[PDB]
Amino acid sequence: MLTDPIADMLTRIRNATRVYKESTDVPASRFKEEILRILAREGFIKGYERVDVDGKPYLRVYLKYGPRRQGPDPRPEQVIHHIRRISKPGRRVYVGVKEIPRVRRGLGIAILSTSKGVLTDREARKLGVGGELICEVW
Amino acid sequence: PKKVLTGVVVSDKMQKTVTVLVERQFPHPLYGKVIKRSKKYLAHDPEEKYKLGDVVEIIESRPISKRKRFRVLRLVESGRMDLVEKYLIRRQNYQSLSKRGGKA
Amino acid sequence: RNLSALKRHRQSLKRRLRNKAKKSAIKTLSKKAIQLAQEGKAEEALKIMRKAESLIDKAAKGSTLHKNAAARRKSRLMRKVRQLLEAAGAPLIGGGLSA
Amino acid sequence: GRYIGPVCRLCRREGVKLYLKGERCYSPKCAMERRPYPPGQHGQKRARRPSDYAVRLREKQKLRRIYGISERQFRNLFEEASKKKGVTGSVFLGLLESRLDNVVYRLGFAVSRRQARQLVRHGHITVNGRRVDLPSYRVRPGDEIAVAEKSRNLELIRQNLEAMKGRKVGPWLSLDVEGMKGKFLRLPDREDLALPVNEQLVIEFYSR
Amino acid sequence: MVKIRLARFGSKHNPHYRIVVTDARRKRDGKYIEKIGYYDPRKTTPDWLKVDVERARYWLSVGAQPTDTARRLLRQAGVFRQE
Amino acid sequence: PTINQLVRKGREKVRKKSKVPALKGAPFRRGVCTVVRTVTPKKPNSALRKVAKVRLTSGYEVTAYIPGEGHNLQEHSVVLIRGGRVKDLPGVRYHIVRGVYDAAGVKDRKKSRSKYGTKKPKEA
RNA sequence: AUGUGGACCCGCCCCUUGGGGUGUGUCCAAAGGGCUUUGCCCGCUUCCGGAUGGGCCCGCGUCCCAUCAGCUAGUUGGUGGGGUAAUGGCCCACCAAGGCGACGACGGGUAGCCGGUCUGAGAGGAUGGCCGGCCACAGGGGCACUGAGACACGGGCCCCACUCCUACGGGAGGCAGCAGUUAGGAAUCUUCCGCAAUGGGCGCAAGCCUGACGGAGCGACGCCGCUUGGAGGAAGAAGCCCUUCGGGGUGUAAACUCCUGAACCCGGGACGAAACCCCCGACGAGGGGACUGACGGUACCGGGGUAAUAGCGCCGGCCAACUCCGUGCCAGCAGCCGCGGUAAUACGGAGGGCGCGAGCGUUACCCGGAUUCACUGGGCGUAAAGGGCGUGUAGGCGGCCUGGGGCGUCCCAUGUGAA
Ligand SMILES: [Mg+2]
Ligand SMILES: [Mg+2]
Ligand SMILES: [Mg+2]
Ligand SMILES: [Mg+2]
Ligand SMILES: [Mg+2]
Ligand SMILES: [Mg+2]
Ligand SMILES: [Mg+2]
Ligand SMILES: [Mg+2]
């Protein structure tokens, strides 16, 4: 089976960006959707949209990259240097609001899910909740 | 607050007493994985009223015998031998594990 | 040598002997009441149980029993005594019992 | 301990001019003056590029041997400015300059720190009217450092406090030449010191 | 019984006591019940005797017994306001 | 290992195996000197090395190096042992304390004198 | 006898495990002493309440070995009784046939646990010594007595071992209380002062007891403060340095240039001690000088006054610091790599130098570095490591959507986290 949908998506993204694809398809989940909302609003992708593939729901994800650099290897800088699933099945990770990590001195985010909903760290430190740490994305 | 526990009757072969299997899940100190774990309680059944299979609430009581310091508070949901079976099977795997074979 | 507080030991003996009699009094008086109750001799049986409850509380005045050690010995006694008189008896003198 | 041996052989080993002979390391004979090569039957041969350790070391014996302090007191001090709030580098120097044997040297009562030490040890110095005979006593700000009533008429004081006429003191001391009573206004800052020392190494040396 | 005494907490040649509620059977310097003051017998500090006087009244009301010296300091703070 | 495996089994820690069974892990043992033999070193060296089979109060029977120049270690002299493998003799993992009991300290040394247990030269 | 009241059996109601009220019957109290003598003091009996101290029960946490896998007969439960302050197979008769175990039972090994301590950036690792809390023991085993409390260290009985007395029948002992002796050991202190302070027992009090304690003694064992202050040349009966009996350094570094003044001497001399008690007011009233100091004539303050202990390790690289001579795989060095075979900065001396300094080195043990048991944070084609392959039990893990619960998870308040 698939044993981890969020990890799966987070990877599909990481993989597709390394080859500088335009979009990339991920099978749809109200939860995965709620995460990409953050990735857009924090500026790591251009956005997602609910396209249907073989009559089955997916989520085209339009990726951003930096500008065409110079010298040998002209390939552009990634907007997503790093992306890592943290709490995984059989290894659930929960932080209270006192223990939420500051990723990369704030030059990057940590998505996490709470009783108030899926938020970034700066957001969840604002409302004073903690929860299931889902991933870093510096 | 006298401790209160929720669990499954797994034995009725005693007079006025039932064995309760209280499960307790909790995260592991070093590795933080959430781990199930369980413990059996002998509980006071004054009217051989709780029959093998159901889920009850166990309450901390004045001692009644050796190793028997709980009375049965109230039934939660009735029969469900899926848990007894899971427990009865677990007990039967010991049939192997010895010096020879057994039942898997 | 010769700590003069072995005088404490001289007293323990003198006390031990005082207690030990009061116990035996209660013991052989309490059996006598039960055994008079297992025969319907209700008058004599309460005449003696009443005496026994008394030595019980008296013996609980000093250190010999004190506490509910006495209470218990009275509870066990009147309970046994009444039941046996209830195998056909009718408490005649009914001294220490209330019905 | 206190070292206490031939001094103007350390002027030479650290290679930096040092004022341990207080009066004499000014006139053309600090030994540094026209003999700046290290001591021993080797001071003139060519020096190989030192290891980063030797650099950190020499930079530390430099600072320590300026104040004439046992390594026991020194490390115990650094480890305090580490635990202390603020920049661990400079706090150190403020503690070293808060030592009463040094303050008495900075206020121009003796010519060297060495002679200054001996004036504390012999109860010629008072802090806030009371006598003090401890070269390691830590002067705080607002502490007026006087000279003993008994010793006011003493030879060395008359001579050494006289030459103080005209000279300026740090922008954290305030001496009064008349009653021979200076005052500790403020904990000195790094730029207040002209110490030919790079504490950044001294920090690194103990971070080993 | 329960008492109110002094438990010595200074240094050699430097005494500092702690007025304390404690069961008499207990060690002098061991686990007491409640601290209710301190006493520096050499008056080296301008505030060399403090007493939670509210509290002393509570322990004296359930039958704490002071030592002769503990009773001194209680009167000095005016625990029993003899007037 | 998976996380479930660390949970089930786990990590196992490391034992200290002492390279000096001076029994009670004391810092020195007394011993009565038996054989005061002479051994030839190994791999890349050559010499006549002074060793000593020692009978320990710890009931042990171990061989130990006699540091310094000459000794004075008879068939029955008594001696003190400390730690110290000698790289060159195998089986020798202890030293003798020059300057204690029958093993008189080295004579006429002027340098490393607190080892070899030579008193201060009377040069004062 | 008296019954304020309390205990017991039946009940009656409230409560809900044996909590509180209530009726009949029964049962249970007591101690006297002193007086500045008929009214004060300290006692005495029953009952309720408080406070302190403690018993028992439960959840959770608490080292290693699976080359320990099955364990259990009072063993698991029941009724009844015994025992206890009280629950309970704690104990006993009778009945049922149960209980525990791979989430490690049974066995073996090791060990007092903790507040803490050491280390580490942290997670973690190591530890439990002083101080404080709890437990256990008092030559070894067992048992009860007395009592509020003991299964009782300086109490009792019995048995076992050791020592001592013995008229040979029988007796006496127990420092793991302060000191001290002895043995063992690498190694661990004075048969000291004192009841002044704090604390304890008893006493109406005066007081008495207190190797609890407060002190002093010994030992660089530890920490912290402090002294040895510093301006000058160099003839080897076997003993002053550097190109051959030869080339500078030691080195501003002195056996003596002034200054100050450790030790030492002389005199003053304490805090710690105000209560208990006496005295007026009522036997706790701002009066007690009633009196009290072991440490100790010490700390500390003032006068006099001497130039007045330096040692230990290291100098091939790691690792700060180099030359001469002697020695020739010898004597020896050595933490690891290594040096010595005639030209040695590595051995041994010397001069010089580096590090620390009343200490400096060696050994031992713990953490570190070691991301080398890797949760943070490692690996397994060839370096160590994929099970010869499958089937599948327990276990771990689990696609999309909706709704309920709120066990996990999160937040606020709160109690606790003693010193
Ligand atoms: Mg008596
Ligand atoms: Mg009567
Ligand atoms: Mg043990
Ligand atoms: Mg013994
Ligand atoms: Mg009593
Ligand atoms: Mg008794
Ligand atoms: Mg006793
Ligand atoms: Mg004894």
Ligand SMILES: [Mg+2]
């Ligand atoms: Mg011996």
Ligand SMILES: [Mg+2]
């Ligand atoms: Mg007293």
Ligand SMILES: [Mg+2]
């Ligand atoms: Mg003492």
Ligand SMILES: [Mg+2]
């Ligand atoms: Mg006074």
Ligand SMILES: [Mg+2]
């Ligand atoms: Mg008064």
Ligand SMILES: [Mg+2]
């Ligand atoms: Mg070097």
Ligand SMILES: [Mg+2]
């Ligand atoms: Mg050497």
Ligand SMILES: [Mg+2]
């Ligand atoms: Mg040579």
Ligand SMILES: [Mg+2]
């Ligand atoms: Mg050499």
Ligand SMILES: [Mg+2]
């Ligand atoms: Mg020192």
Ligand SMILES: [Mg+2]
């Ligand atoms: Mg590690």
Ligand SMILES: [Mg+2]
């Ligand atoms: Mg580590």
Ligand SMILES: [Mg+2]
């Ligand atoms: Mg890992």
Ligand SMILES: [Mg+2]
């Ligand atoms: Mg590896």
Ligand SMILES: [Mg+2]
């Ligand atoms: Mg291989």
Ligand SMILES: [Mg+2]
């Ligand atoms: Mg294979």
